């Protein structure tokens, strides 16, 4: 089991006939543990803003969540645990573990609920595995 197979087999897998467009597992320091082939280049300020939003829910909501310079509208999330964004019919879920960040970026016809399913459940497993 590699970090790449966690992305390839447990994030980019089929979910009700749909697939994420991008997915990644990041250390909270901003380093890539593994990512899909075209996952956006996350800026240090974007990582810092994500970390701050988990620490202080509502931090990004008025200004937007940014991934590789692309702006997402912060929608309903889970305080301290899950960031969720929307950009048109697409969106993103960011699930925090104790040490890492689990990313999933989707487009139509995939839904936010299907993205939440794959991203949060893998993040839950990593937490239960001590990560």
């Amino acid at each position: 089991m590699s970090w790449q197979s966690y992305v390839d087999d447990h994030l980019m897998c089929e979910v009700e006939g749909n697939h994420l467009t991008h997915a990644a597992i990041f250390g909270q320091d901003g380093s890539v543990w593994a990512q899909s082939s075209a996952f956006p280049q996350l800026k240090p300020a974007e990582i810092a803003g994500i970390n701050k939003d988990f620490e202080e829910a509502g931090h990004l909501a008025p200004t937007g969540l940014f991934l590789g310079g692309e702006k997402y509208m912060v929608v309903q999330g889970e305080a301290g645990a899950v960031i969720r964004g929307k950009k048109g019919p697409g969106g993103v879920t960011i699930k925090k573990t104790t040490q890492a960040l689990v990313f999933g970026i989707y487009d139509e016809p995939m839904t936010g609920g299907q993205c939440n399913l794959v991203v949060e459940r893998l993040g839950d497993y990593l937490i239960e595995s001590g990560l």
Partner: peptide, 9 residues
């Protein structure tokens, strides 16, 4: 340094 990947579920 990433920790080792946990055993798969």
């Amino acid at each position: 340094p990433p920790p080792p990947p946990p055993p798969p579920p």
